[PDB]
RNA sequence: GGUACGUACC
RNA sequence: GGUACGUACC
């Protein structure tokens, strides 16, 4: 039966009376249950007053649509009202305009509403209540704020029709922590709180205060630790890679103004690779390309075990053999290419055997081991999460746990959890694969997640006894969310990091920022109504101006026979701009009748690459379309030469040219 | 593919 | 504003 707790009621009270508010409840409090109570109460009143009651619940992830239906929204509203969940994933055969007419409570991803609002029609007047789950994203150019700026534009247009009366929905913001917006001062922290209040049109932000004793007993915070590693072990792997990197730099004559295995080095060598590609300096760019891989190995050794650093290099040269070697069904090896390959093969014997000695592994891995061992022996049936930065680190830590049988002995049974986006070097986990791992984690089949930021917000994950942030420090919101996953009995939160990395210091800034947030919320709540209304109006007014400036900026092509495509590695003439066409208005393809002569095919739409004939540089991959084998060219791999200038682009849209169908 | 947000570094 | 890492939505 649908009932609230006393702290839940306290916070819900103004939204039941018909006021726009933001609800701030910690993780595990039941903010989604408060939403269901407010939606029924809102709709039950509209029945008794003989009026059109309609709710729309907006969420930031597709899994949350399914999730809010099963657990909360259907059980209490299905028999009494028409309820539905939507997303871009679900291929529905009804238009969203019609889905509005037919249903009382619509749970969906926020972009589905905006798609309809943009262009029978949909307007925000059609809904009487709008609930925005995870409402701290109602900011900048996000989907929530684009929905809300229409509401504010209608609010201003409504006062014009008072003087010369279009209806407007109630608004409910739901979140754990609103954030401070990277503010380093209490003034800027308060400014950010008022801005998201102004974005959601909240007449008051709401927190548990009177019944704060009940909330503290309901959700119990973990014990916070900070496991620092000074890293005063000898590192012969780092030293031996540096010697290789130093040898390569003397060959190509490219010297840095920065330390080896650092981020400013990574930026430098990519810029140097891009310069050397533009200026037809094959020697320099190939050395810069290889130097980046040796630079990756150093920073891989800094986070995960050095066997991974070896494999990153070892796989790179394995793929170079595949591309450079002339297979059947078809020299590529330059002096520079032969020099770099010999250099690896010479020092490959040592690096492989040096990597097998765990005395020279990273110290953070020993700290991670110690933290895992003592905490998984602590309880009968434990559960935990290791937050790491990269996808590679997540997979590599999963192998480290598996290739070390004392974790299997003690109780741990691990599995990685990563994103589904396709803009990384590491492969993605699909949304269905993500769903299956979190289910097994809850069931007990899986014991320990090694996740990226995928695991921190929104998704329903089982209560953890331990959550470790293995080197990862993001922002104040994500810190509270990661700490919020630890809510089992005798739970602990931990930050395993190197003192040299500066992550320990950046966490203390987030702790400082989290304190400013609670002070700021208090000050905005205590603020008198006239002072509040003035400030909320000012931010609402300048928020509209902000979009007009970006709209005019975005409002700011030529002719396709102006350009030609050179191979970035070897500078050979390949295509004119007239040869290009687009498929589905996204994937670009070359048409030229005698294009087959200039490339070869290798395995790793299709799993068949396209590489240069003369030099073995990747151009892209093949694809089937209407029973025709067509070559998909990725813009990354080409130097575009103009008639008037030579430049490289990362995306096809960055060109000042439109192409045919 | 497009777009959004987060973080570090310039 | 740029480079990368990360996550997401259509
Ligand atoms: N008033 C209540 N009475 C009984 N159970 C509740 C109440 N509020 C919440 N719950 C339960 O507690 C859980 C809340 O979890 P969740 O919705 O994930 O919280 P949040 O969204 O704040 O993280 C749900 O499983 C729900 O069944
Ligand atoms: Mg919930
Ligand atoms: Zn080439």
UniProtKB/TrEMBL annotation:
GO cellular component: cytoplasm
Chain sites annotated for binding ADP 1: 3, 5, 8, 28, 30-31, 33, 487
One GO MF term attached to the UniProt entry: RNA binding
Protein residues bound to Zn(2+): 567, 570, 612, 615
UniProt-annotated location(s): Cytoplasm
Reactions accelerated catalytically: ATP + H2O = ADP + phosphate + H(+)
Stretches assigned to the RLR CTR domain: 556-661
Domain (Helicase C-terminal): residue spans on this chain: 371-536
Residues the record lists as binding Mg(2+): 32
EC category: hydrolase
GO terms classed as biological process: defense response to virus; innate immune response
Boundaries of every Helicase ATP-binding domain copy: 12-196
EC numbers, comma separated: 3.6.4.13
UniProt keyword list: Antiviral defense, ATP-binding, Cytoplasm, Helicase, Hydrolase, Immunity, Innate immunity, Isopeptide bond, Metal-binding, Nucleotide-binding, Phosphoprotein, Repeat, RNA-binding, Ubl conjugation, Zinc
Binding site for ADP 2: 3, 8, 28, 30-32, 72
Family: Belongs to the helicase family. RLR subfamily.
Protein name: RNA helicase
Range within the parent protein: 298 to 988 of 1001
